[PDB]
Amino acid sequence: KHNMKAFLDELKAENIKKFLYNFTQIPHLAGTEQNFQLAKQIQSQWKEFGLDSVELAHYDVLLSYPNKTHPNYISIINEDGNEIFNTSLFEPPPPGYENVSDIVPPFSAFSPQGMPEGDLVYVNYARTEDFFKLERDMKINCSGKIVIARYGKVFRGNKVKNAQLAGAKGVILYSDPADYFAPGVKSYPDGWNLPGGGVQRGNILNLNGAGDPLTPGYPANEYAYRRGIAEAVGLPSIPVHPIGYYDAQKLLEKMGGSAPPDSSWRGSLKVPYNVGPGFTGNFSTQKVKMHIHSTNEVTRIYNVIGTLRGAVEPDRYVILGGHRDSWVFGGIDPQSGAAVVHEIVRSFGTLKKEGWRPRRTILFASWDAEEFGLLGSTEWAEENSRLLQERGVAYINADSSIEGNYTLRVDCTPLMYSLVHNLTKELKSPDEGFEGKSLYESWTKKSPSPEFSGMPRISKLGSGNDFEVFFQRLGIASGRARYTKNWETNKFSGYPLYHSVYETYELVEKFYDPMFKYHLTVAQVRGGMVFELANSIVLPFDCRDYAVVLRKYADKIYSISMKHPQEMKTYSVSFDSLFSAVKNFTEIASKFSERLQDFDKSNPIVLRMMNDQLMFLERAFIDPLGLPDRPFYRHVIYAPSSHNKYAGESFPGIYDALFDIESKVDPSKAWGEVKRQIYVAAFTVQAAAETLSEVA
Amino acid sequence: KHNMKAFLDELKAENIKKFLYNFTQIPHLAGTEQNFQLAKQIQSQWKEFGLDSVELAHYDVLLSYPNKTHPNYISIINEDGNEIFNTSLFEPPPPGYENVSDIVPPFSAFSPQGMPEGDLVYVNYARTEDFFKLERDMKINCSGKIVIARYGKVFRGNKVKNAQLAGAKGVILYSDPADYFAPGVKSYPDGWNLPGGGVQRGNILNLNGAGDPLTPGYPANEYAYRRGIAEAVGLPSIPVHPIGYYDAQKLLEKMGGSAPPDSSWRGSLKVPYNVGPGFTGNFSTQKVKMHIHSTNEVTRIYNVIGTLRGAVEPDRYVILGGHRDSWVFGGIDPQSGAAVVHEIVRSFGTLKKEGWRPRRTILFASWDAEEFGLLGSTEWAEENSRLLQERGVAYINADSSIEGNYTLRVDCTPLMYSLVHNLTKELKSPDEGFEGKSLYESWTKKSPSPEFSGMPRISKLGSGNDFEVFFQRLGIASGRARYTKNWETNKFSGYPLYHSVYETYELVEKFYDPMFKYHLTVAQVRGGMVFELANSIVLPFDCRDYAVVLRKYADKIYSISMKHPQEMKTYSVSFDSLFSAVKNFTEIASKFSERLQDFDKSNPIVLRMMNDQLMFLERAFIDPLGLPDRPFYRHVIYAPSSHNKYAGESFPGIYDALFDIESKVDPSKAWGEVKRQIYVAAFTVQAAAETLSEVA
Ligand SMILES: *[C@@H]1O[C@H](CO)[C@@H](O[C@@H]2O[C@H](CO)[C@@H](O[C@@H]3O[C@H](CO[C@H]4O[C@H](CO)[C@@H](O)[C@H](O)[C@@H]4O)[C@@H](O)[C@H](O[C@H]4O[C@H](CO)[C@@H](O)[C@H](O)[C@@H]4O)[C@@H]3O)[C@H](O)[C@H]2NC(C)=O)[C@H](O)[C@H]1NC(C)=O
Ligand SMILES: *[C@@H]1O[C@H](CO)[C@@H](O[C@@H]2O[C@H](CO)[C@@H](O[C@@H]3O[C@H](CO[C@H]4O[C@H](CO)[C@@H](O)[C@H](O)[C@@H]4O)[C@@H](O)[C@H](O[C@H]4O[C@H](CO)[C@@H](O)[C@H](O)[C@@H]4O)[C@@H]3O)[C@H](O)[C@H]2NC(C)=O)[C@H](O)[C@H]1NC(C)=O
Ligand SMILES: *[C@@H]1O[C@H](CO)[C@@H](O[C@@H]2O[C@H](CO)[C@@H](O[C@@H]3O[C@H](CO)[C@@H](O)[C@H](O)[C@@H]3O)[C@H](O)[C@H]2NC(C)=O)[C@H](O)[C@H]1NC(C)=O
Ligand SMILES: *[C@@H]1O[C@H](CO)[C@@H](O[C@@H]2O[C@H](CO)[C@@H](O[C@@H]3O[C@H](CO)[C@@H](O)[C@H](O)[C@@H]3O)[C@H](O)[C@H]2NC(C)=O)[C@H](O)[C@H]1NC(C)=O
Ligand SMILES: *[C@@H]1O[C@H](CO)[C@@H](O[C@@H]2O[C@H](CO)[C@@H](O)[C@H](O)[C@H]2NC(C)=O)[C@H](O)[C@H]1NC(C)=O
Ligand SMILES: *[C@@H]1O[C@H](CO)[C@@H](O[C@@H]2O[C@H](CO)[C@@H](O)[C@H](O)[C@H]2NC(C)=O)[C@H](O)[C@H]1NC(C)=O
Ligand SMILES: *[C@@H]1O[C@H](CO)[C@@H](O)[C@H](O)[C@H]1NC(C)=O
Ligand SMILES: *[C@@H]1O[C@H](CO)[C@@H](O)[C@H](O)[C@H]1NC(C)=O
Ligand SMILES: *[C@@H]1O[C@H](CO)[C@@H](O)[C@H](O)[C@H]1NC(C)=O
Numbered sequence A, B: 001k002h003n004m005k006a007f008l009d010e011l012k013a014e015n016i017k018k019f020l021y022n023f024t025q026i027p028h029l030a031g032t033e034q035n036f037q038l039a040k041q042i043q044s045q046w047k048e049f050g051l052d053s054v055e056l057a058h059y060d061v062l063l064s065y066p067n068k069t070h071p072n073y074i075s076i077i078n079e080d081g082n083e084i085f086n087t088s089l090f091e092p093p094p095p096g097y098e099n100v101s102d103i104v105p106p107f108s109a110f111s112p113q114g115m116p117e118g119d120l121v122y123v124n125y126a127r128t129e130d131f132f133k134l135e136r137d138m139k140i141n142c143s144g145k146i147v148i149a150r151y152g153k154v155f156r157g158n159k160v161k162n163a164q165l166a167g168a169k170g171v172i173l174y175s176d177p178a179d180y181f182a183p184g185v186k187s188y189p190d191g192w193n194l195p196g197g198g199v200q201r202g203n204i205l206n207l208n209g210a211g212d213p214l215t216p217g218y219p220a221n222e223y224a225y226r227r228g229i230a231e232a233v234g235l236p237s238i239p240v241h242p243i244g245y246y247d248a249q250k251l252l253e254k255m256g257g258s259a260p261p262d263s264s265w266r267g268s269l270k271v272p273y274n275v276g277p278g279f280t281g282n283f284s285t286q287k288v289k290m291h292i293h294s295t296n297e298v299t300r301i302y303n304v305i306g307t308l309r310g311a312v313e314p315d316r317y318v319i320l321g322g323h324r325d326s327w328v329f330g331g332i333d334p335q336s337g338a339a340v341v342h343e344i345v346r347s348f349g350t351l352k353k354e355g356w357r358p359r360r361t362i363l364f365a366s367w368d369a370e371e372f373g374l375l376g377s378t379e380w381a382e383e384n385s386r387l388l389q390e391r392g393v394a395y396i397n398a399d400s401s402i403e404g405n406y407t408l409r410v411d412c413t414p415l416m417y418s419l420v421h422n423l424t425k426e427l428k429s430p431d432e433g434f435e436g437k438s439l440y441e442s443w444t445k446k447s448p449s450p451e452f453s454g455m456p457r458i459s460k461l462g463s464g465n466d467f468e469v470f471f472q473r474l475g476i477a478s479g480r481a482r483y484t485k486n487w488e489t490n491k492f493s494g495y496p497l498y499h500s501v502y503e504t505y506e507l508v509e510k511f512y513d514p515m516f517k518y519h520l521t522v523a524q525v526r527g528g529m530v531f532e533l534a535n536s537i538v539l540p541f542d543c544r545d546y547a548v549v550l551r552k553y554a555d556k557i558y559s560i561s562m563k564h565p566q567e568m569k570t571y572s573v574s575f576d577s578l579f580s581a582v583k584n585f586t587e588i589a590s591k592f593s594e595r596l597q598d599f600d601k602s603n604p605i606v607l608r609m610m611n612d613q614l615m616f617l618e619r620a621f622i623d624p625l626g627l628p629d630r631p632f633y634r635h636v637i638y639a640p641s642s643h644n645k646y647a648g649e650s651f652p653g654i655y656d657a658l659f660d661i662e663s664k665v666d667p668s669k670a671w672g673e674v675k676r677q678i679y680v681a682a683f684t685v686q687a688a689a690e691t692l693s694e695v696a
């Protein structure tokens, strides 16, 4: 038969392994010839696999590259202007890749150019609370200083924004072994740890969902009108550069001024972690000098878009998308995901060649320029926003398949909780000790829900990947899944070799997943979700799961406000309308679920009428006016944290109105805005609930 | 049978006559007890007529009223401060209504309070070009002057905005007999002309689609957070008051300073129409003083919403809406429309009682507070925007049924041109001399299209009525129809008694439509359009008509730009992308129309898939970022003129970028914005075209 089992059985670990090897032999940096060649290869292969059409969609977007003949580096300079220490010009290449051409050296993409020279202030992780501690408590002023910040905890673009706002004239990012060196594990190539010469690449934009800096709101097509640089969205105003911990130790070791305020400011290097500013007595006349010569350049990028047309609802789209561009070899990020997508396409194509089609259309996407700010996914979504908003059922992301090998991670809309629970109960666990058990069983045992007994953890979607435009701008139900680390025992950030030259095929094959069993499990989770979404008669969304989470989020935001009881009294700040809206959503969702199970199952119009109510439910949380000063974050329930793009925040409008409210100079205005955000949230919740009422 | 003929035959002129009489005996000013009582009556009657449900939807919105014990008036004052002439406190009430309570005296709703005293400048119609003529050519400065402007040509809110921007400290609006007194016709009650004591009421806001000034973007419900007054949308900053031509003659007769620049500045009064500033020699020490004491007050308003549930697509809405609130008796505006809606509901209800239902749901609306800025329609649309944007097929307005008795007027989306042509060919003309001919025949003969032989004129939708939120904010196909004057021979603005106490049942019965035959014809046009929209298997929209008009609009905007050939060369301003997009839309629309006629007619999914493409076509012209500084005007092809809310403008983004461009101080920035608007228009046209392509 042609059912989900046939689809799942056709997926092969050996094929994913072959595809990963094929995708990781040379770098595929966005905007380069090598990445265009890979796009053409994937287009050809998807056509051979059996898709109905496979096209390239190209855009000309702002990218950023170092200057090949004027390299970026940081110096310590003495008072005579002699450069007495210089940071590395490149990462030592891994074994057997020492002759590989076009490895981009470490840089912070979109840094402006400059040669700032000054005294160093150490700012821990450069989080909002680290700057509060510096300014408010320690009385240390970052104005005109170069700040040095360790990577980890929050997206690097937020670190840069924070340092800017503090008055820094430059930022040095580094990987501390505390965050990137797991105890008892060897450095690459002998283990999966970051060596002292390893460096994390990555963009430092603050786009807030805009896509290409030059064309916010519209696709960067052939006739696009571009903003000038000075009006571009999200570019940093001060030079920024990343270094490894051998170079960081040389910059930190001479630091003087104030002691670190507490142990949470100390990494693992043999240095005092003094905050500064500047160096101790003997070295006090020395300074730090950055030399950044990178350039921003409008550059063509290419998405591959494959279509498998639906048999019954060809105007309903289920999208499986992940990116193809990499910083260097992309052994994990993204090619561990792209190899999984490739095998998924191949499996669907095998069924299609035997005469099967899914009920709904499935679109497959190989996005470009994700590493430069989600640029390929967002420009294509801007070009196709009308089709997506009226026909888009769901988006399933497919970046890295592994960030560890311990258990499953899922982040998604509450509309997909039941789907995920049900699918994982039918899949085999790949874990040692769980032979013959379900994936649901091993995942729930290893990663218990903080709320419910015998349920697994599912997180909110944050951001920092290609689902952002589909979920927080367009309101299309979205999800992601991968294998992850043991969250109890592993205190490090992500995986140690993230966005380094050392992220290779060998890293994966030797240290993460030699049997490709975790990759296969992730292909079964992502593929199975796409299968159910595209083939289930009734869309596999449970609106009642949204009701449960809305109450949890309402309790949470109310609890934050309730730290200020005097102000709530004075300004008559009530959450009554929001709780009322959540109560109503709960009631209306229950009655809808009854209809959904009791409706005349012979009637396709009642069915699609009810499928449209299911599809447009995520869409109902969109506010066309967007969130304050973030017009492309339009979802009222979920936005990326204003302090950390990677983290989701619930009721973000209210959260940001309440954040550090006790420091606002005009409490009446600040609490008025809290009340405005309560109104907007309560209204949006009730309006979303009413989409599930009887239609007439 | 239950078909359109049965529906049309059930409509009776005598019933419309009875309903008009019933609706016009007392005033129904928005926010008053009398208008709430009428709402409850209409709710009860719609229930009796057979609708499935009939509810009141209420909102608390900012309204404006004169102070009953501190009346508004204008004086001439001598240099001792004696008030030697005062304008009237009220219009002389018409015969047999001299004892009617609660007639609101003439005022300009939403004027601020004040007692400005100064010299008079006469500004013709206070249009943008009148102020250009004054400032640029005549070198007359309106700063700190009271301006006196004749009504007509443009919406009065635009006059007020223009005078503000000119630095006026107050505005006096008056009705000149040139614009409100048809030659050879008697003044009310002996004819349909405006008498010298008659005055036109009306709001002077500049809301640009926002709805209630205090709650832009969200419904003004029980828990709404309101802006403070100072942050409210669209309120005038200077006092404004309207007067009749007896009072205007007393203000104009002493005017000195400059002669009128030409005959187009002269009305029909026996005065010189001197521009000023101030009075001639002998009266030069005299001044004009306004006394305005009106107050803005948040006040409850009530929409009646009736539902006739669809048999097959109950989640598809066809809306027939018109307002119920009036300035005084509302004999034409709105009750000539509301009586027609009432008879339409009754006719549909008769069919329903016999076991018929329409294919799609029909919603019927009696809007409140239209006269105060489209407030009831817009607040309800804001509350229900998610349901409307995903389920709204079409909106048919139903304000005044007559503005004359010569021929038909239709303004609507190009998507409804074919519907209207076809429907009018099946209706009987009510015109003398056209007995036994079609309405199409009499309308085409009397009002030929300026473009095509043997076709009637259909105008673009402008604004100043309750379709604005549905069409220019939400992108729901919209239309309106009424009987109108002879446009060749009648040079006056609208009808003379517009928004006066004299607009009564007797006005209509004696002078406009004694037999109620024109009202019946308008009920057949509005009702027949609602019938076809709600019952036709395939939605009755022809996408190819949009293609034809898009080319006309592209030619028009290109022709405007081409008055500046040197600048187009210098700044490389090309319309190539827009013409390309229009060409593509034309091609894609043609192929869609073929599919629509050749599709397997047995397949409901291909049918509704194609009905959704038809429904979402108007929706595709919406830009979620809105037009520059007008976030609630989101339709890219059509917006109300920035110079006259009543007029539609095509490609408004490009039009406004080009307007008076030769006066801009920075031509490179101004032509850059023209190019940006070309890009936005070309992209939106192509994106709309692609919604009609094969879906997969
Ligand atoms: C969760 O869902 C419930 C419904 O189950 C909603 O309940 C509504 O709550 C509002 C209050 O926010 C109620 O509003 C009140 O309406 C009264 C009139 O209601 C009647 O008439 C209307 C038509 O106008 C019908 O729709 C309705 O069915 C009733 O027949 C008003 O008179 C009230 O105003 C008076 O009291 C208030 C409060 O003291 C004063 O401020 C006013 O000045 C005035 O004196 C009031 O506006 C509404 O009736 C409820 N609808 C119901 C029960 O069907 C919740 O609002 C919803 N939660 C959210 C967040 O939306
Ligand atoms: C009206 O509809 C037509 C289609 O019938 C659209 O035509 C497209 O027009 C654009 C130009 O705006 C063409 O863009 C060009 O694409 C070339 C590659 O096209 C091939 O590969 C792509 C995938 O990447 C396929 O989609 C496509 O089918 C082709 O197989 C590029 O190489 C071109 O760039 C080069 O030339 C330009 C111009 O000199 C330079 O600026 C560049 O630097 C570069 O050298 C160019 O981008 C596109 O191919 C056309 N599509 C077709 C024919 O299917 C119109 O755009 C549309 N009108 C509007 C307003 O949208
Ligand atoms: C995940 O799997 C669960 C468990 O199978 C699914 O819930 C079950 O769904 C079925 C089919 O809708 C329900 O059966 C229905 O029962 C009612 C009365 O109980 C009956 O009137 C209907 O005719 C129908 O038989 C079943 O009750 C329900 N079981 C539960 C909730 O425990 C669930 O829908 C799946 N989630 C998805 C698909 O997203
Ligand atoms: C307004 O009325 C006109 C005139 O009747 C309508 O156009 C006509 O629509 C019919 C039905 O779709 C067309 O018939 C079709 O003809 C094609 C080939 O000619 C055939 O393959 C189909 O099976 C079908 O019979 C007819 O051609 C067409 N006539 C025209 C355009 O002159 C029109 O659709 C109406 N407008 C509406 C409903 O909005
Ligand atoms: C990745 O796999 C592809 C597909 O097998 C390889 O590309 C093929 O290479 C052969 C020999 O050069 C050609 O004859 C084919 O035309 C190619 N096919 C396509 C679709 O491009 C590619 O060589 C492999 N890359 C690596 C690094 O192994
Ligand atoms: C307008 O018509 C309505 C409906 O016929 C009249 O209201 C009715 O009046 C009678 C007598 O007062 C009552 O017994 C009914 O209960 C009323 N019905 C409703 C639905 O309100 C109303 O009197 C008429 N108004 C005018 C000015 O003639
Ligand atoms: C890169 O550096 C070289 C060598 O100093 C210089 O000539 C060139 O302009 C730079 N490239 C840029 C700015 O793209
Ligand atoms: C650092 O680099 C600069 C630029 O090439 C050079 O002048 C300096 O000698 C170098 N310093 C060291 C310690 O190698
Ligand atoms: C920080 O630095 C500059 C002085 O160079 C000054 O403008 C700013 O106000 C300082 N802020 C403090 C000490 O809080």
Ligand SMILES: *[C@@H]1O[C@H](CO)[C@@H](O)[C@H](O)[C@H]1NC(C)=O
Residues within 6 Å of the ligand: A192, A404, A405, A511, A512, A513
């Ligand atoms: C993968 O699993 C093995 C065996 O459980 C373990 O030794 C190894 O550390 C894991 N690798 C990573 C990178 O976590």
Ligand SMILES: *[C@@H]1O[C@H](CO)[C@@H](O)[C@H](O)[C@H]1NC(C)=O
Residues within 6 Å of the ligand: B067, B068, B069, B070, B295
């Ligand atoms: C209206 O005028 C009276 C009489 O002078 C005054 O007492 C009252 O305050 C005014 N009403 C308002 C401002 O609503």
Ligand SMILES: *[C@@H]1O[C@H](CO)[C@@H](O)[C@H](O)[C@H]1NC(C)=O
Residues within 6 Å of the ligand: B075, B083, B084, B085, B086
């Ligand atoms: C105009 O009205 C004021 C206010 O009541 C009064 O003082 C004045 O005498 C009136 N003037 C005339 C000419 O009636």
Ligand SMILES: *[C@@H]1O[C@H](CO)[C@@H](O)[C@H](O)[C@H]1NC(C)=O
Residues within 6 Å of the ligand: B141, B142, B143, B144
């Ligand atoms: C108009 O009036 C005022 C003087 O009262 C002045 O500020 C303004 O610049 C004048 N403009 C002219 C004469 O153009």
Ligand SMILES: *[C@@H]1O[C@H](CO)[C@@H](O)[C@H](O)[C@H]1NC(C)=O
Residues within 6 Å of the ligand: B192, B404, B405, B511, B512, B513
């Ligand atoms: C209505 O029609 C009659 C007869 O054609 C005409 O005398 C009258 O002026 C018309 N009324 C209006 C208000 O145009």
Ligand SMILES: [Ca+2]
Residues within 6 Å of the ligand: A210, A211, A212, A214, A215, A216, A217, A218, A219, A220, A379, A382
């Ligand atoms: Ca863009």
Ligand SMILES: [Ca+2]
Residues within 6 Å of the ligand: B210, B211, B212, B214, B215, B216, B217, B218, B219, B220, B379, B382
């Ligand atoms: Ca509002």
Ligand SMILES: [Cl-]
Residues within 6 Å of the ligand: A397, A398, A399, A400, A465, A480, A481, A482
């Ligand atoms: Cl992912």
Ligand SMILES: [Cl-]
Residues within 6 Å of the ligand: B397, B398, B399, B400, B465, B480, B481, B482
């Ligand atoms: Cl109308």
Ligand SMILES: [Zn+2]
Residues within 6 Å of the ligand: A323, A333, A334, A370, A399, A400
């Ligand atoms: Zn990635």
Ligand SMILES: [Zn+2]
Residues within 6 Å of the ligand: A333, A371, A499
């Ligand atoms: Zn990455």
Ligand SMILES: [Zn+2]
Residues within 6 Å of the ligand: B323, B333, B334, B370, B399, B400
């Ligand atoms: Zn009206």
Ligand SMILES: [Zn+2]
Residues within 6 Å of the ligand: B333, B371, B499
């Ligand atoms: Zn009116």
